[PDB]
Amino acid sequence: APDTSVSNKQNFSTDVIYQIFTDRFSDGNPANNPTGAAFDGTCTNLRLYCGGDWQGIINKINDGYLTGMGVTAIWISQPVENIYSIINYSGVNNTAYHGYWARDFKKTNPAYGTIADFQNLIAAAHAKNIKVIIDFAPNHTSPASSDQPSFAENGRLYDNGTLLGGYTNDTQNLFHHNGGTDFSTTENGIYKNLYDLADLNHNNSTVDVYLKDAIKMWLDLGIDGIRMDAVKHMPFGWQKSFMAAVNNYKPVFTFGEWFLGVNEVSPENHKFANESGMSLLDFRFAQKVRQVFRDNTDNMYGLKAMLEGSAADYAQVDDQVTFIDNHDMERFHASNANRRKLEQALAFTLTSRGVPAIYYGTEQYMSGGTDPDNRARIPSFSTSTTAYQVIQKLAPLRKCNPAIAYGSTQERWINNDVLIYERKFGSNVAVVAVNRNLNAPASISGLVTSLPQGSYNDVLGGLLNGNTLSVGSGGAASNFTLAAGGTAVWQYTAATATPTIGHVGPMMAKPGVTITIDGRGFGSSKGTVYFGTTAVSGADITSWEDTQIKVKIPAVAGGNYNIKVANAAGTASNVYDNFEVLSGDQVSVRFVVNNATTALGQNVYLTGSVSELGNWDPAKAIGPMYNQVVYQYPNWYYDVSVPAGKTIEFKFLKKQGSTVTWEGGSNHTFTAPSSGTATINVNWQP
Ligand SMILES: OC[C@H]1O[C@H](O[C@H]2[C@H](O)[C@@H](O)[C@@H](O)O[C@@H]2CO)[C@H](O)[C@@H](O)[C@@H]1O
Ligand SMILES: OC[C@H]1O[C@H](O[C@H]2[C@H](O)[C@@H](O)[C@@H](O)O[C@@H]2CO)[C@H](O)[C@@H](O)[C@@H]1O
Ligand SMILES: OC[C@H]1O[C@H](O[C@H]2[C@H](O)[C@@H](O)[C@@H](O)O[C@@H]2CO)[C@H](O)[C@@H](O)[C@@H]1O
Ligand SMILES: [Ca+2]
Ligand SMILES: [Ca+2]
């Protein structure tokens, strides 16, 4: 199948995602609507159920709303059973309409539909080449109080109907009882409650095994991807172990929510996206798009630095899910705003690197402040808006123009208000010119591109006041005027002769797991695939076609490898780096080291005998370790994904910058559990 196939669960870079708050989209089956105080059919009270369901989505998938817009994937609210309580928060009634208050991850929220409804949703979507992403929020259950067990459902957790436990009398330690986080440190936000949400303890084996089994049920139901909630709030090591359970079973595109504020750039965020086994929602891209196009708090140079910085910071920048707004921001379109600002921000996102995501109703110019005001029912299903047309014209290019799906990004012309950038992949090119200045045109001269000689019509057809471009020898464009608020897209497409890799997924799995290598010019006959210097060919290459290769990971030692392919004639492709071969199935193990005193600016890290612990390379040690919450300095702790059942030798390190101090004495040893979790507690050896 081609890289662009609906069947490709590992690559969403050629797709355009439409994020749907299920309850607020379309009530296709009134019979499953919640009743009484939990319901508002008029959807005036945005905190109660308005009736939106899976049957309504199936309807809008079948009547052309989404397909006519060029949407090729949907990301829907968490599908699992939620508590039924109507929680009164200081005089105001609140319902689980959002799907974030799970009670049973093995069942459906009956308000959305049954299991059968879900299967129908999956089938209806696939029949229309639309992929289905589900939200999954394994960080907590629901609002709970230990001392007031009658409040809400006491964060109770069930396993397909069977009670596992609640927040009160949590003798099993299913949850954390450390108070609530003030978001003051990352450690603090991981091990303390988010608001009043009962925080799940992933170090509890029952919780661990349960969540990993629950996701398998969803994978079996045919989902194509997962949107993980609150990733900055669960142990990174446990999450890596959770991504390995997914990938070592049935891999699907996964991205997590890790909020970043205006002007925030977090190296922690980068390393997570780079090493966890899941990518992230691109808040850095989104917040910068809002400053430049929405709020006027930064200009094109700042958009350019974000583009260049992110391409450098994210190992797979093309896996980052971009957007201009979501359920946790004020709607991009301000009631009083010029619509062109939204149109432009949209055109920019759709033609930029990564995986574009559109919040439902953006194409309808919905406006609204923060929660729950950004979550109104979609007021119209009109295909006639300028915004809808922009998406319609640009969304499909991610499938037909691989420069947009996988290309590099290059600035070709720039000033405070204008940015002309170029995407390129193999024999494919796309050039986009944007003039944020809504009152002043710009005179464009000296623009040089990789576009072949000729006249190029604006793909948007002048919809956003774009123009035709004339390119001469050298890719030099003749002078032109870029209209006020003008936006234009020019492209060139042709068959690619040399093997070129545009994407790899999943990026972490154990040997034997099948990976998907997508791009152009692989040719029709099986060639060779390389993992580092190791060559794979023949039977282990399950399938091979010009744009997509399916191959089994060889049984090489656990570690990081660069992927390269060669065609049947032996011509090599570019190298796609950072593939991580796991040492085997993974379990989440908590390491604890006592009496590891440090100087300010120095932290403790873990290193050891397996690739999962960096193979004794301080440059790859695990950390920095924690020392506030579960244990207190000078005792440090950290949850780490390690190979199940393996006997592993380890040591702790004190690092400052790249300077390293090793624990003295002999290595410590332990044998990882074959399943579930474990905790190893040792003393720092001088
Ligand atoms: O001609 C090559 C040149 O193109 C662009 O330079 C623009 C510049 O961004 C504008 O602000 C203005 O000065 O016109 C220049 C071209 O005449 C690229 O930005 C630049 O890197 C490139 O060398
Ligand atoms: O909270 C983490 C903190 O740990 C390390 O600092 C120790 C410090 O070395 C001791 O001198 C003492 O002051 O307790 C600190 C922890 O409260 C790291 O030095 C520091 O960078 C890190 O944030
Ligand atoms: O480099 C491989 C080597 O790393 C670790 O050895 C440490 C040792 O523990 C330290 O006390 C100090 O001497 O530095 C060595 C690294 O240069 C592992 O302990 C050892 O097994 C491993 O082979
Ligand atoms: Ca309904
Ligand atoms: Ca947590």
UniProtKB/Swiss-Prot annotation:
It catalyses: Cyclizes part of a (1->4)-alpha-D-glucan chain by formation of a (1->4)-alpha-D-glucosidic bond. The keyword Calcium applies. Ca(2+) 2 binds at residues 139, 190, 199, 233. GO terms for cellular component: extracellular region. Its cofactor is Ca(2+). Ca(2+) 1 binds at residues 27, 29, 32-33, 51, 53. Substrate binds at residues 100-101, 140, 145-147, 193-196, 227, 232-233, 327, 371, 375. Residues 1-138 are annotated as: A1. GO terms for molecular function: alpha-amylase activity; cyclomaltodextrin glucanotransferase activity; metal ion binding; starch binding. Keywords: Calcium, Disulfide bond, Glycosyltransferase, Metal-binding, Secreted, Signal, Transferase. Residues 203-406 are annotated as: A2. GO terms for biological process: carbohydrate metabolic process. Residues 499-580 form the IPT/TIG domain. Residues 139-202 are annotated as: B. Belongs to the glycosyl hydrolase 13 family. May consist of two protein domains: the one in the N-terminal side cleaves the alpha-1,4-glucosidic bond in starch, and the other in the C-terminal side catalyzes other activities, including the reconstitution of an alpha-1,4-glucosidic linkage for cyclizing the maltooligosaccharide produced. This is Cyclomaltodextrin glucanotransferase. It comes from Niallia circulans.
